[PDB]
Every structure is written in structure tokens, then in C-alpha cells.
Ligand binder design. Structure first.
Ligand code: HEM
Ligand SMILES: Clc1ccccc1C(c1ccccc1)(c1ccccc1)n1ccnc1
Length: 424
């Protein structure tokens, strides 16, 4: 696991280490002061050299210059500020219904299989859930993957992500499948763009959402390619990392009984057996909140980010040449005993009330101007999903399932988190 190699080198060779990552020289930077310096200033910006890979894959245009992959400050600032509107307090509150609907549906589907003997992939289940939530919430569309629909669409996402991996970590069947899948994704967008426009044209009233803001950001452009870049971007960013995080959380909890009991007790105190979770109910799921923060420390789906160091600089008593991609890793810093006591122990008490917040040693949603636009969105959906599962279902990992990670485009469980389930 590449990230675990970086961890070793970080601990042995100190806070500034030259590496080869995605075929390039970069320098991994692991002091909290360096994380603060570079990530908390609009001065430093993403390295296009590292983000080019994501713009186009095997010749086929993918995320282009969408909100994630755009590295020029001014160009990203113009899109971020218009798209920010789709993430206001009251926009996210408007999504609680989607969040509750999909969560409820997931649980019933699992409840129908809850005999203690039917192996279910919590990875796939959680993936379908996040995708269904994203599609409705952001785009006003219903994929219904939870109901077995859109099998080709999920096949297409699967091959695209395998494609990302292959293309940046060092086969002709795959190559066509992958190009095919990326085109499929972009066509799905072209479609859902027509659908929206066609509703507006006949003068229907469409509640403001994410799609609204990315059309709006594209107003005054000769074509729709920037629009689709952004459609594919949110399509993927808005579900894959949430699903990874949900899958890791469930995987870890299966060997954490004391913690689950306490999670069950909390759910029982603040919501009991209530069916629909209001906004104000999430705020009070304090212990669940800690478990989730702790899941992200050990298992961040998005392990880090790159900033371009434009000029030779002294970082932690090491001269670093100009034009150097700086690598930051919350995965690495999360596992260093110098920042976290007993780093390998899953202990949600680290995030308890009273405990000093981690000081630039923990950034699962990144930091500063290029941090995750979807943070609050994600935190809400996973709480809703996790709370529902904690109310109703008990999980048991299938013997011979592993607890390890694989680095694909993001960090995800090695094994698909196969479980048998039981009503609570
Ligand atoms: C547990 C879930 C999630 C995690 C851990 C996560 C993590 C991250 C991180 C680390 C970044 C910075 C990436 C980089 O520097 O290359 C990022 C960016 C981004 N994520 Fe998330 N994210 C998650 C969920 C979401 C959701 C739910 C959405 C959409 C609703 C979303 C949309 C975005 C977008 C558009 C950006 C680019 C932001 C910008 O640079 O202005 N993500 N995410
Ligand atoms: Cl390319 C990808 C696939 C699946 C999930 C996330 C990403 C992505 C990313 C960012 C930096 C380095 C590798 C992958 C991503 C990059 C560009 C466009 C969309 C998603 N991402 C991480 C967090 N949010 C989005």
C-alpha cells in the first residue's frame, strides 16, 4: 500500500521526504506547521502536473477543469463562489428528505435479508445508497441502484475508477472498456442536462440544487464541455468518498462491540425508534460524530492533496527546489505516534468533548480554500445512514473477510465488507 510506504519513510526520514508518486518527483511534507503554512493560504495552489491525470484518462476527457481538477486560482474561484450557493445551511437542510428516504430504503432492503445467513456486500450496498442520494440531491434524478436499476451505469463507474488507477500507477480490453465507460458517464450528463433544460423550457419550477449552480456557472460559454466536466466531477466526488467512508466505518465497527453498544444506546436516547431524523437530531448524535471522525483518521478515502511550490523554499530545515509538487497526507499524519497516542487503536474518545482538537494533523476533507465543498453535505448523509443502521440492524463480518485497504483512485476496503445481518 503506497501510503503505508510513505508512512514508514515519514517516520524514519523526518518531516520532508522526496518520493516518486504517480510517476513524478514530489516532496512529502508532514509537520503540522508545514500543513498550516501551505494549505491555509490562497498563495499556494494545486499542481496541474499532478491533476492533469484526472483531466483526461487514456485520451478520453473526464473531469476536465471541473471544481476539483482546476488548479488555477482565479478560474477555480469563479466557479467555487457560484457553486457555493448550492451548499448553504438552508440548501443542505432541504436535503434531509432525500437523505431519510434513501437511508430508510437501504435499511428495509437489508432487513429483508436479515436472517444471519445471507452474505451481503456492505460496500456495494453503501455505494448504491450514496449514488442514489447524490443523483436525487444534486441532479433531481432517481437512479434506484438500491432497487437493482442502472446496472450498466454502475458498471461504467466501476471501470472508470479502475481506469484512473491503471493510468497513474504504471490490458487493451480494459483500455476500451475504460474509454467506453468515460463516454457513458459524459452522455448520462448530457442527458440529465437536457432533462433539466427541457423542464425549464416548458416553464416548470425546479427547486434550486447543485445542477442549477453548475449550469449557472457555465452561462456564457460556447459549449457544454465545462458543464459536463463539472457534472462528472460531482457525480463522482459526491458519492465515491462517502461510500468508501461508510464502508470503512461499518467494517471497523464489526470488531468494535463496546463502541457499537454505546452507539446503540445514544441512538436509543436521542432518536429512540423514531423513523425520520430531523436536522436538529444529527447535531445531538455526538458519539456517532466522534466514531466518524475517528473512522476518517485511520481510513481517509481521500488520503491527501498536492500544492505547487513555485520557488525554492526552506521547509523544516530542508531546501526544496522550486517547481516542486508538495505532497500532504492525512493518512500518514493520522498514523504517526508523534501526533496520535497509540495511532493504530480505533478510539473515538480522542474526539470527545474537552479533548484539544487536532492541530493540522487531521484533514480528511483537506484544509483552506481548496477543502471539500461537500463536507457538511457528507457529514449529514453518513450520520443519517449510520444512525438508521444502528437503530435496526446488527452486522457480522463474514469469516475470511479482511480488514485491509487497497489504493484505487481513493482508499477503500480490500474486501467488499461481506456481512450477515440480524434485526436488533
Ligand atoms: C466522506 C466524504 C467525503 C470526503 C472524505 C471528501 C474529501 C475531499 C477532499 C480531501 C477534497 C480535496 C481534494 C483535493 O485536494 O484534491 C475534496 C474535494 C471536493 N469534494 Fe469532497 N469529500 C467527501 C464527500 C463529498 C461530497 C458528498 C461532495 C458533493 C456533494 C464532494 C465534493 C467535492 C468537491 C466538488 C471538491 C472540490 C472542492 C474545491 O476544490 O473547491 N465531496 N473532498
Ligand atoms: Cl478521481 C476520484 C475518484 C473517486 C473519488 C475521488 C476522486 C477525486 C480525487 C482527487 C485528488 C486525487 C485523486 C482523486 C476527484 C478528482 C477529480 C475529480 C473528481 C474527483 N476526489 C477526491 C476527493 N474528492 C474528489
Amino acid at each position: 500500500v503506497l501510503q503505508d510506504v510513505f508512512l514508514d519513510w515519514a517516520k524514519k526520514y523526518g518531516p520532508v521526504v522526496r518520493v516518486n508518486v504517480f510517476h513524478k518527483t514530489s516532496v512529502i511534507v508532514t509537520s503540522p506547521e508545514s500543513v498550516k503554512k501551505f494549505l491555509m493560504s490562497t498563495k499556494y495552489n494545486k499542481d496541474s502536473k499532478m491533476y492533469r491525470a484526472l483531466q483526461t484518462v487514456f485520451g478520453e476527457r473526464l473531469f476536465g477543469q471541473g471544481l476539483v481538477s482546476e488548479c488555477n486560482y482565479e478560474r477555480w474561484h469563479k466557479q467555487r463562489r457560484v457553486i457555493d450557493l448550492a451548499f448553504s445551511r438552508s440548501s443542505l437542510v432541504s436535503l434531509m428528505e432525500t437523505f431519510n428516504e434513501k437511508a430508510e430504503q437501504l435499511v428495509e432492503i437489508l432487513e429483508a435479508k436479515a436472517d444471519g445467513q445471507t452474505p451481503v456486500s456492505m460496500q456495494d450496498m453503501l455505494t448504491y445508497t450514496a449514488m442514489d442520494i447524490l443523483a436525487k440531491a444534486a441532479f433531481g434524478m432517481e437512479t434506484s441502484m438500491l432497487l437493482g436499476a442502472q446496472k450498466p451505469l454502475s458498471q461504467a463507474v466501476k471501470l472508470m475508477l479502475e481506469g484512473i488507477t491503471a493510468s497513474r500507477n504504471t490490458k487493451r480490453k480494459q483500455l476500451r472498456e475504460v474509454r467506453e465507460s468515460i463516454r457513458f458517464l459524459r452522455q448520462v450528463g448530457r442527458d440529465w442536462v437536457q432533462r433539466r433544460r427541457e423542464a425549464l423550457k416548458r416553464g416548470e419550477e425546479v427547486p434550486a440544487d447543485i445542477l442549477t449552480q453548475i449550469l449557472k456557472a457555465e452561462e456564457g460559454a460556447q459549449d457544454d464541455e465545462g458543464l459536463l466536466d463539472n457534472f462528472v466531477t460531482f457525480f463522482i466526488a459526491g458519492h465515491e468518498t462517502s461510500a468508501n467512508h461508510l464502508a470503512f466505518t461499518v467494517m471497523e465497527l464489526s470488531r468494535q462491540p463496546e463502541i457499537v453498544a454505546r452507539l446503540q444506546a445514544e441512538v436509543d436516547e436521542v432518536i429512540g425508534s423514531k423513523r425520520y431524523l430531523d436536522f436538529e437530531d444529527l447535531g445531538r448524535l455526538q458519539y456517532l460524530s466522534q466514531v466518524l471522525k475517528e473512522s476518517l483518521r485511520l481510513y481517509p478515502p481521500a488520503w491527501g492533496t498536492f500544492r505547487l511550490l513555485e520557488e525554492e523554499t526552506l521547509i523544516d530545515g530542508v531546501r526544496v527546489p522550486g517547481n516542486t509538487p508538495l505532497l500532504f497526507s492525512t493518512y500518514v499524519m493520522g498514523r504517526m505516534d508523534t501526533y496520535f497516542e497509540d495511532p493504530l487503536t480505533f478510539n473515538p474518545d480522542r474526539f470527545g468533548p474537552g479533548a484539544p482538537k487536532p492541530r493540522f494533523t487531521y484533514f480528511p476533507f483537506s484544509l483552506g480554500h481548496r477543502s471539500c465543498i461537500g463536507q457538511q453535505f457528507a457529514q449529514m448523509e453518513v450520520k443519517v445512514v449510520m444512525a438508521k443502521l444502528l437503530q435496526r440492524l446488527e452486522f457480522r463480518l463474514v469469516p475470511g473477510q479482511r480488514f485491509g485497504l487497497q489504493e484505487q483512485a481513493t482508499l477503500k476496503p480490500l474486501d467488499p465488507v461481506l456481512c450477515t445481518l440480524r434485526p436488533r
